[PDB]
Design a protein around this motif. Structure first.
Motif, mmCIF file in Angstrom:
data_model
loop_
_atom_site.group_PDB
_atom_site.id
_atom_site.type_symbol
_atom_site.label_atom_id
_atom_site.label_comp_id
_atom_site.label_asym_id
_atom_site.label_seq_id
_atom_site.Cartn_x
_atom_site.Cartn_y
_atom_site.Cartn_z
ATOM 1 N N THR A 164 6.206 -43.885 -23.264
ATOM 2 C CA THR A 164 6.200 -42.470 -22.895
ATOM 3 C C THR A 164 4.968 -41.761 -23.437
ATOM 4 N N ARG A 165 4.823 -40.496 -23.055
ATOM 5 C CA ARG A 165 4.023 -39.512 -23.784
ATOM 6 C C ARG A 165 4.483 -38.134 -23.314
ATOM 7 N N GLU A 166 3.891 -37.075 -23.861
ATOM 8 C CA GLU A 166 4.271 -35.712 -23.485
ATOM 9 C C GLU A 166 5.778 -35.443 -23.616
ATOM 10 N N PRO A 167 6.347 -35.672 -24.812
ATOM 11 C CA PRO A 167 7.791 -35.501 -24.955
ATOM 12 C C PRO A 167 8.159 -34.050 -25.231
ATOM 13 N N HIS B 28 -3.715 -44.077 -19.591
ATOM 14 C CA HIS B 28 -3.913 -43.392 -18.315
ATOM 15 C C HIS B 28 -2.858 -42.304 -18.109
ATOM 16 N N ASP B 29 -3.286 -41.119 -17.676
ATOM 17 C CA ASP B 29 -2.378 -39.969 -17.597
ATOM 18 C C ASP B 29 -1.530 -39.854 -16.332
ATOM 19 N N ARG B 30 -2.105 -40.170 -15.176
ATOM 20 C CA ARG B 30 -1.495 -39.749 -13.911
ATOM 21 C C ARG B 30 -1.278 -40.856 -12.879
ATOM 22 N N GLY C 284 6.847 -37.779 -11.399
ATOM 23 C CA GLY C 284 5.563 -37.113 -11.546
ATOM 24 C C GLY C 284 4.939 -37.285 -12.914
ATOM 25 N N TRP C 285 3.797 -36.631 -13.123
ATOM 26 C CA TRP C 285 3.005 -36.820 -14.343
ATOM 27 C C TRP C 285 2.730 -35.529 -15.124
ATOM 28 N N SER C 286 3.446 -34.461 -14.783
ATOM 29 C CA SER C 286 3.409 -33.208 -15.546
ATOM 30 C C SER C 286 4.709 -32.488 -15.265
ATOM 31 N N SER C 287 5.340 -31.931 -16.299
ATOM 32 C CA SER C 287 6.689 -31.409 -16.117
ATOM 33 C C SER C 287 7.085 -30.248 -17.022
ATOM 34 N N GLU D 214 -3.444 -23.699 -20.788
ATOM 35 C CA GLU D 214 -2.816 -24.983 -20.479
ATOM 36 C C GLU D 214 -1.580 -25.210 -21.338
ATOM 37 N N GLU D 215 -0.627 -25.969 -20.799
ATOM 38 C CA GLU D 215 0.460 -26.552 -21.595
ATOM 39 C C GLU D 215 1.181 -25.558 -22.507
ATOM 40 N N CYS D 216 1.697 -24.483 -21.920
ATOM 41 C CA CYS D 216 2.377 -23.449 -22.692
ATOM 42 C C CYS D 216 3.674 -23.934 -23.337
ATOM 43 N N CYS E 159 0.036 -21.197 -25.901
ATOM 44 C CA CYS E 159 -0.571 -22.199 -25.034
ATOM 45 C C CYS E 159 -1.816 -22.839 -25.651
ATOM 46 N N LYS E 160 -2.587 -23.538 -24.823
ATOM 47 C CA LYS E 160 -3.837 -24.158 -25.255
ATOM 48 C C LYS E 160 -4.985 -23.672 -24.370
ATOM 49 N N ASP E 161 -6.052 -23.183 -24.992
ATOM 50 C CA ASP E 161 -7.294 -22.881 -24.285
ATOM 51 C C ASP E 161 -8.116 -24.150 -24.374
ATOM 52 N N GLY F 144 0.249 -35.414 -32.682
ATOM 53 C CA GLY F 144 0.010 -35.276 -31.253
ATOM 54 C C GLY F 144 0.513 -33.940 -30.744
ATOM 55 N N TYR F 145 1.068 -33.924 -29.535
ATOM 56 C CA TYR F 145 1.599 -32.684 -28.962
ATOM 57 C C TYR F 145 2.725 -32.094 -29.813
ATOM 58 N N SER F 146 2.879 -30.773 -29.758
ATOM 59 C CA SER F 146 4.028 -30.111 -30.369
ATOM 60 C C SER F 146 4.445 -28.935 -29.494
HETATM 61 C C1 LIG Z 1 -5.996 -32.709 -16.702
HETATM 62 C C2 LIG Z 1 -6.290 -31.683 -17.759
HETATM 63 C C3 LIG Z 1 -5.818 -31.978 -19.171
HETATM 64 C C4 LIG Z 1 -6.882 -31.650 -20.210
HETATM 65 C C5 LIG Z 1 -8.051 -32.577 -20.303
HETATM 66 O O1 LIG Z 1 -5.295 -33.297 -19.289
HETATM 67 C C6 LIG Z 1 -4.237 -33.637 -20.182
HETATM 68 C C7 LIG Z 1 -4.636 -33.895 -21.665
HETATM 69 C C8 LIG Z 1 -3.664 -34.797 -22.542
HETATM 70 C C9 LIG Z 1 -4.070 -35.040 -23.944
HETATM 71 O O2 LIG Z 1 -5.101 -34.278 -24.425
HETATM 72 O O3 LIG Z 1 -3.425 -35.775 -24.668
HETATM 73 C C10 LIG Z 1 -2.614 -35.693 -21.781
HETATM 74 C C11 LIG Z 1 -2.050 -35.031 -20.533
HETATM 75 N N1 LIG Z 1 -0.914 -35.668 -19.930
HETATM 76 C C12 LIG Z 1 -3.012 -34.335 -19.614
HETATM 77 N N2 LIG Z 1 -2.443 -33.712 -18.430
HETATM 78 C C13 LIG Z 1 -2.515 -34.313 -17.114
HETATM 79 C C14 LIG Z 1 -1.901 -33.542 -15.963
HETATM 80 O O4 LIG Z 1 -3.184 -35.323 -16.922
#
Ligand SMILES: CCC(CC)O[C@@H]1C=C(C(=O)O)C[C@H](N)[C@H]1NC(C)=O
Ligand SMILES: *[C@@H]1O[C@H](CO)[C@@H](O[C@@H]2O[C@H](CO)[C@@H](O[C@@H]3O[C@H](CO[C@H]4O[C@H](CO[C@H]5O[C@H](CO)[C@@H](O)[C@H](O)[C@@H]5O)[C@@H](O)[C@H](O[C@H]5O[C@H](CO)[C@@H](O)[C@H](O)[C@@H]5O)[C@@H]4O)[C@@H](O)[C@H](O[C@H]4O[C@H](CO)[C@@H](O)[C@H](O)[C@@H]4O[C@H]4O[C@H](CO)[C@@H](O)[C@H](O)[C@@H]4O[C@H]4O[C@H](CO)[C@@H](O)[C@H](O)[C@@H]4O)[C@@H]3O)[C@H](O)[C@H]2NC(C)=O)[C@H](O)[C@H]1NC(C)=O
Ligand SMILES: *[C@@H]1O[C@H](CO)[C@@H](O[C@@H]2O[C@H](CO)[C@@H](O[C@@H]3O[C@H](CO[C@H]4O[C@H](CO[C@H]5O[C@H](CO)[C@@H](O)[C@H](O)[C@@H]5O)[C@@H](O)[C@H](O[C@H]5O[C@H](CO)[C@@H](O)[C@H](O)[C@@H]5O)[C@@H]4O)[C@@H](O)[C@H](O[C@H]4O[C@H](CO)[C@@H](O)[C@H](O)[C@@H]4O[C@H]4O[C@H](CO)[C@@H](O)[C@H](O)[C@@H]4O[C@H]4O[C@H](CO)[C@@H](O)[C@H](O)[C@@H]4O)[C@@H]3O)[C@H](O)[C@H]2NC(C)=O)[C@H](O)[C@H]1NC(C)=O
Ligand SMILES: *[C@@H]1O[C@H](CO)[C@@H](O[C@@H]2O[C@H](CO)[C@@H](O[C@@H]3O[C@H](CO[C@H]4O[C@H](CO[C@H]5O[C@H](CO)[C@@H](O)[C@H](O)[C@@H]5O)[C@@H](O)[C@H](O[C@H]5O[C@H](CO)[C@@H](O)[C@H](O)[C@@H]5O)[C@@H]4O)[C@@H](O)[C@H](O[C@H]4O[C@H](CO)[C@@H](O)[C@H](O)[C@@H]4O[C@H]4O[C@H](CO)[C@@H](O)[C@H](O)[C@@H]4O[C@H]4O[C@H](CO)[C@@H](O)[C@H](O)[C@@H]4O)[C@@H]3O)[C@H](O)[C@H]2NC(C)=O)[C@H](O)[C@H]1NC(C)=O
Ligand SMILES: *[C@@H]1O[C@H](CO)[C@@H](O[C@@H]2O[C@H](CO)[C@@H](O[C@@H]3O[C@H](CO[C@H]4O[C@H](CO[C@H]5O[C@H](CO)[C@@H](O)[C@H](O)[C@@H]5O)[C@@H](O)[C@H](O[C@H]5O[C@H](CO)[C@@H](O)[C@H](O)[C@@H]5O)[C@@H]4O)[C@@H](O)[C@H](O[C@H]4O[C@H](CO)[C@@H](O)[C@H](O)[C@@H]4O[C@H]4O[C@H](CO)[C@@H](O)[C@H](O)[C@@H]4O[C@H]4O[C@H](CO)[C@@H](O)[C@H](O)[C@@H]4O)[C@@H]3O)[C@H](O)[C@H]2NC(C)=O)[C@H](O)[C@H]1NC(C)=O
Ligand SMILES: CCC(CC)O[C@@H]1C=C(C(=O)O)C[C@H](N)[C@H]1NC(C)=O
Ligand SMILES: CCC(CC)O[C@@H]1C=C(C(=O)O)C[C@H](N)[C@H]1NC(C)=O
Ligand SMILES: [Ca+2]
Ligand SMILES: [Ca+2]
Ligand SMILES: [Ca+2]
Ligand SMILES: [Ca+2]
Lengths: 388, 388, 388, 388
Positions: free
Chosen positions: B36-39, B69-71, B97-100, B196-198, B211-213, B323-325
């Motif tokens: 996984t990622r983006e939990p 790979h993201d998408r 999908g790859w964003s949710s 991004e990513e609010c 969010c993230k600028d 990582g993400y939070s």
């Molecule tokens: C596509 C723009 C964005 C910033 C570079 O990418 C992300 C960064 C991510 C990251 O910095 O870890 C992973 C993400 N899953 C991603 N989003 C998508 C839709 O691919």
């Protein structure tokens, strides 16, 4: 709970959106995923699920060797949660056999599995998870049925069966069930000359089934069923946009009442949505093999022998393996129309990829959108070399 | 069942207690755990669950190779029971999908998944486990959304989307959904220059998103949404305690209405709770990479460009990968206040640990306590060498 | 649903019958079974389940190496269906931590997990699967609790905690919870000189806890709790039938109000049922190590410093490894009395079996019968050599 | 919920249709499938499930070595969803022991497991998933019971037990339970000279059990039970169509009141449906070993010592291994008659296949049809060489 009635028309189809995908072969490279083929999707009033015929072994299991074989005693119709893969631990067995259909009537689900040797096969009809009725082979030559969901109206669920040759005239029957019991059956009438593996959907106009002529035709035969009168008609899709596989190239005049010639003794299960100007046909991209998949908007395809596409959408690239395809809808969804859906079986392994000794598949599924959505392509995604 | 209303304020945050942890990478060394990622975490009225984007393979599976790979077409939003790991056999697919994002409105859950190629992506909005609405890309450049839960008030669930460049001005929209249907959407207004990513949460004052600028700012942009009027404002956290990553060192004057400069074209999803004297900010400990995690009590961080920490808590040591939070709350808990919670994604594998060919994560999650609790640290806990 | 009240006496205990056994180590030799220790059993009104502290790895997983370790960040209280093994796919996480208790009050379940470093540990009290209250360490020395189920009466669930030395005087507290909230706590009173890992059960007379004196005593301390008044007393089992491990040989005079001497700084969690002539004590067969297990009928063991056994039952042969043991009852069973039950932890691996690098256990459990049943013995059953 | 009453007669049996099959050995070659033996099937009012005695190890697990052994401490009665295999992750433990029976009374399920050494075994009777009553060995020689489902009428569920020699006169008792409590027990009366492993079913005429005489007889003893009066009779199937295994060849005169001679100290669990002209007997095809399985329509087999078959159906070819067989019915099905069903245990491994060190089985199950259906054969389907 009440029996579902087909009271709505189809939603306007302007594109197709991703609905489900299980990535079963990818995951099964390192998980206990059952070998399957002949998958489909079907909804209950509270849940939609993936269905398929298991081969009674996992992909990594040594018993995956030889699973190109169609009709063993080790097959069963299984169902599992939407977009999960069919695993040993999450798959629910609906019945035992090597050809099936299944549908919910609004109150309970009917599932039908056929088993037996070629000359002595029989169908068992289950309702509410119990066996209710049985049907013996009438032509002693591989009694077989839809391989996708049936459709119900006010408790009546028609099912198309065929018994007899796959390479000549056969004996097709339409059965009408209620609570698993046989109300009526009829011999095939109309101009369809050979019928297999019908893909059906229902709407206010009645039930429409798009089938496969395995004998002579590369256009698809269509059966139209009135579930109230319990009667039917049949013909072919008139359109010169031919949708069987393998098939000849598209001519400019199709055939409404006879097989379009060029390819004999072959074919694949497929589907269409036949709805006047809202008509969409599915087909493999290749004319030679089960590769690629595309949807084409072909106005009045059913009745217009000159009809051509005015819009389309690629689902699977020609470079990627496809396979069976069929129709289903969530009849219990909110709103004023039924949203057309379909699945495509993505076959991996034999015969096309013979470095492995197994045959299996994964599933991708789409439903229609009233938006004009951007298109992607949806491959199985497994690397065959990982299995060597 | 009634729609949930945001009728409470935040509980007083005096420390953070352990809420959940799945140890997914440890367990997946020898179990069928999905990559996984983006939990994130999100609650229903009767259950709270872990969510993430699967990569459609297990960690030990050969298809884990390349999962930085993201998408891909093999991704899906899955959910699974709190603190269990995401396994093949216990994960429920919410959409493909790859964003949710996903959230429960008190009656049913809305889940949104985006799929497609970079120039033709689309969102599908699911409600009560059925697809309801679809949104096509408007800027043809990776339509994308929150990667954590949305929030609802009286049936209205706002969601922040961005389509366009990650390294320059983009087109951000705020959509307002009810029962999956689009009530309204607005273009981004206010002083936030890139979104991004609010990470969002709701309380009586309204909905707050941190969010993230990704373009220019190492301070975090904030969107404040009124779900009744369906309107919003935006700015940045004024505080000089900078919370993006990578980022410059903390100055003594922050920026309220423009990106704080030093790091371009980079960033990480993060969150904060902005509540006057009860304000707490999350950030990575490192200014250079996604390592460590800490919470800092920064009074009036949103509006005070001189504000500094007066209390803190280490969550993950700098020696360990984070990582993400993002934020979530159990809106259906008993009591007079909403207890602030958050998760931290603990990324393992690529790019930082390239002896393995995969990228995955585990989850740790905390909620606030009115006690002043002793602190521990919470590493992923897997030994990368075991996977070699 | 109503809160359960302790309205019944104990059933007459004439022998013990097999209740549950999971064979976890046998099965985990070739299945995804989590490494555990500190197990117990606890009932809901509609189901009884096994509980334990996971180590956040399976036995065959490489992360099983080092699991003799007690207090990592990778531990959690899990529960799973009766007599199934604790697997990755069937285990439900109740909370995160390395010391726990749990009990159902008739309406909902309270679970308590302690986590943190030795000098900064904290308890989180969950009720109805949500965190409700938190307790910080008061002695900064491994805050810890029962490792078996608590007991409730009219919504009040007492729990025994200890914080401080394991080899000298410590600070023991009895907390009284209702719906997860702290009603009251008291410092330990009475003649018990050291308290750890209380095993509790309830009946009309009140709540009885049999604990472990780790400091000086090889007799077991007892805490008797009135859940209505929220008060308690403490002493030791007066009987010269000593039940800790390791321990001296049985004398002819026991000790009611002080530790019986011979073994310092050691012990094991254990239990008893103290009910006048219906009194039964559990103990390891060995006086030196955690091997074997037996039940002994010792009339008035609590109050009679001369009391000896008049009946017994072997549970585990001395040749086989045992471990922790504790009490539980199905408070929601039909009938006029509460049927006494217990479990025994069967520890495999380190320190006693050091050819493997892990430590885990399986569970066996018995309940009382009014019949005089024939006895068997119940070993873990795994062959350690299979794991080499 | 009401107690079920036996108000219907048997449906007319004109053939047998496939009901369930789990392919457990095939799947367990590469999945976590438990080693079992002594399987059966039993229905609840809302679900039918497979049952068996686990050996507390998977087939691929090293602990499968030695599982020819009948009575270890590692056995338990488990149940699992119809036609799924018995896996570690989907199997529900009903009780602990090495001989069992189980049945639902319309309100709740009673399960009985026997455990212990040969000279000190005991039965524990569970009702609604709780232990209720216990029975100590009365002959100190392997107390044992049906190994298939019991049957209930108005809450009364009779069960046949035997304690004593398998090679001479033993002490058989019929117990009558209600809600797990013992209403009454009787010593065996009638002309049956030895009784083991009764297979029972119920209909308006009462409860009929077809058992095994292990001592002298190759005809099967029958016990007929009146669950209202709580009384019984016994004799043998009069028919010269002999149905035990091993057995002599079929004579032309059978024996009604004494063992038919030729084979001593051996036998297999089996079943029949005894219903006048609607009578069907099951048996192995081989007279020497547990191979093949067939059903034979033998009018008045119970009472006619000259009766011969007038119709039949092969279930398993003589070339394939069979094993135990027993009766069950879905007493909660719709309609005016009870549909006769049975299962056949398909034993793989030792003693017949000794290249492997384990013994296990899979299950096939059929129910009756009023149609005259074509027949297939139903082998286990595993290739033993894959396990080497
Ligand atoms: C596509 C723009 C964005 C910033 C570079 O990418 C992300 C960064 C991510 C990251 O910095 O870890 C992973 C993400 N899953 C991603 N989003 C998508 C839709 O691919
Ligand atoms: C982001 O995503 C979006 C959404 O998906 C993408 O937009 C999509 O793009 C795809 C690919 O181009 C489109 O699919 C094709 O659609 C055409 C049909 O539309 C065209 O033709 C229409 C009909 O025109 C005719 O009638 C009208 C009457 O009104 C008349 O005006 C006209 O003059 C003519 O007489 C046009 O109306 C239409 O124009 C409209 O749409 C345009 C955009 O598409 C737009 O620009 C215009 O302004 C206007 O609005 C348009 O011109 C299908 O024909 C086509 O399908 C054929 O081609 C594919 C290969 O691409 C093939 O696989 C198909 O099978 C099929 O071709 C075979 O069959 C034919 C029929 O027999 C035959 O004639 C062919 O020779 C061919 O046969 C051969 O191959 C087959 C298969 O192997 C074999 O069996 C045969 O034997 C033989 O060997 C596509 O489906 C989408 O419609 C479009 N969607 C939307 C909403 O726009 C977008 O591209 C993405 N963006 C990016 C940047 O990637
Ligand atoms: C058991 O567990 C308990 C509970 O967890 C443990 O107790 C906790 O201990 C931790 C660690 O010490 C504390 O976290 C730190 O908190 C301080 C803030 O509190 C201090 O400062 C307060 C503010 O004082 C100022 O204003 C007041 C106004 O009232 C004024 O009076 C005062 O003079 C001054 O002007 C004080 O109020 C506070 O005192 C109180 O609390 C004390 C206990 O903490 C107590 O002793 C006192 O009596 C009184 O009650 C206290 O002095 C945070 O500042 C700190 O966070 C900074 O430091 C950490 C490293 O430790 C760093 O990671 C943070 O990012 C941050 O430092 C960076 O950012 C700053 C802001 O820009 C910057 O100034 C720094 O230079 C630094 O920047 C650099 O690093 C960052 C990150 O890499 C980088 O981005 C920059 O660019 C740059 O490179 C900690 O959060 C807990 O608050 C405390 N909790 C409790 C309840 O006590 C206990 O220790 C455990 N027990 C054991 C035995 O282990
Ligand atoms: C089928 O299954 C059934 C059911 O399970 C089996 O029957 C069971 O058999 C077992 C094994 O024999 C019995 O367990 C033992 O029970 C005795 C207690 O019962 C005996 O003593 C009673 C008390 O007598 C005294 O008081 C009475 C007052 O009424 C007075 O009359 C009498 O003279 C005397 O003063 C007797 O009442 C009782 O008689 C009755 O029962 C008999 C059957 O048992 C029957 O024949 C009679 O007719 C009558 O009905 C009987 O004589 C326990 O003492 C014993 O436990 C000790 O021994 C075991 C080893 O076997 C040991 O592990 C225990 O820890 C304990 O011994 C240690 O502790 C003692 C106390 O401090 C100490 O004195 C010992 O020296 C010893 O200490 C040493 O070891 C320990 C542990 O390592 C260590 O800590 C110390 O430091 C030291 O090193 C057993 O529990 C069952 O009760 C019995 N059940 C039933 C229902 O009968 C049957 O065998 C099975 N069938 C087959 C064929 O296998
Ligand atoms: C598609 O599927 C369908 C449906 O399954 C298939 O049709 C089925 O075919 C099978 C196989 O043939 C049939 O099973 C056999 O049934 C016979 C019984 O039926 C025959 O006999 C009846 C009785 O006749 C007697 O009484 C009547 C009174 O009315 C009198 O009229 C007559 O003269 C005579 O006196 C006949 O009524 C019946 O005729 C009817 O049915 C015919 C079709 O079957 C039809 O053609 C007729 O027109 C009419 O309608 C018919 O003749 C069983 O006897 C037989 O079982 C024996 O043989 C098998 C081996 O095949 C063996 O395993 C059995 O154990 C048994 O034989 C052993 O036991 C006997 C009794 O003791 C003994 O006498 C034997 O010597 C033998 O003993 C030896 O072996 C055993 C076992 O190892 C050992 O223990 C002993 O010690 C010793 O060593 C079969 O069960 C089905 O009934 C039939 N079903 C239907 C609906 O038709 C069809 O074939 C499939 N299609 C294709 C193309 O494959
Ligand atoms: C038996 C006729 C028919 C056409 C050749 O066979 C099918 C073709 C299939 C195929 O073309 O992929 C696979 C099917 N599962 C099959 N149906 C059965 C019952 O075996
Ligand atoms: C103990 C008597 C009996 C007859 C020899 O044994 C059985 C025969 C069996 C068999 O013939 O396959 C297996 C059984 N599980 C068994 N029952 C028990 C309780 O062990
Ligand atoms: Ca064709
Ligand atoms: Ca940034
Ligand atoms: Ca001690
Ligand atoms: Ca015999």
């Amino acid at each position: 709970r009440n029996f579902n009635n087909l009271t709505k028309g189809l939603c306007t189809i302007n594109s197709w959106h991703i609905y489900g995908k299980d990535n079963a072969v990818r995951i099964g490279e390192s998980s206990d995923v059952l070998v399957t083929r002949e998958p489909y999707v079907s909804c209950d009033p509270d849940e939609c699920r993936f269905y398929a015929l298991s081969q009674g072994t996992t992909i990594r299991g040594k018993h995956s060797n030889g699973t190109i074989h169609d009709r063993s005693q080790y097959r069963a119709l299984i169902s599992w949660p939407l977009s999960s893969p069919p695993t040993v631990y999450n798959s629910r067995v609906e019945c035992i056999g090597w050809s099936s259909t299944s549908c919910h009537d609004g109150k309970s689900r009917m599932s039908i599995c056929i088993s037996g040797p070629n000359n002595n096969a029989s169908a068992v009809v289950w309702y509410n998870r119990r066996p209710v009725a049985e049907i013996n082979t009438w032509a002693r030559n591989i009694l077989r049925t839809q391989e996708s969901e049936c459709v119900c109206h006010n408790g009546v669920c028609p099912v198309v069966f065929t018994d007899g040759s796959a390479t000549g005239p056969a004996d097709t029957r339409i059965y009408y069930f209620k609570e698993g019991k046989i109300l009526k059956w009829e011999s095939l009438t109309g101009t369809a000359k050979h019928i297999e593996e019908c893909s059906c959907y229902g709407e206010r106009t009645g039930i429409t089934c798009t089938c496969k002529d395995n004998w002579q035709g590369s256009n698809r035969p269509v059966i139209q069923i009135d579930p109230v009168a319990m009667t039917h008609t049949s013909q072919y899709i008139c359109s010169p946009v031919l949708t069987d596989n393998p098939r000849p190239n598209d001519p400019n005049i199709g055939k409404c009442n006879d097989p379009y010639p060029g390819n004999n003794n072959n074919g694949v299960k497929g589907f269409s949505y036949l709805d006047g100007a809202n008509t969409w046909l599915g087909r493999t991209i290749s004319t030679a093999s089960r590769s690629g998949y595309e949807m084409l908007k072909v106005p009045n395809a059913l009745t217009d022998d000159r009809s051509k596409p005015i819009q389309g959408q690629t689902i699977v690239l020609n470079a990627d393996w496809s396979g069976y395809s069929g129709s289903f809808m969530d009849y219990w969804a909110e709103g004023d129309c039924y949203r057309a859906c379909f699945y495509v079986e993505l076959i991996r392994g034999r015969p096309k990829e013979d470095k492995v000794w197994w045959t299996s598949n994964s599933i991708v599924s789409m439903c229609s959108s009233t938006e004009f959505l951007g298109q992607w392509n949806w491959p199985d995604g497994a690397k065959i070399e990982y299995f060597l």
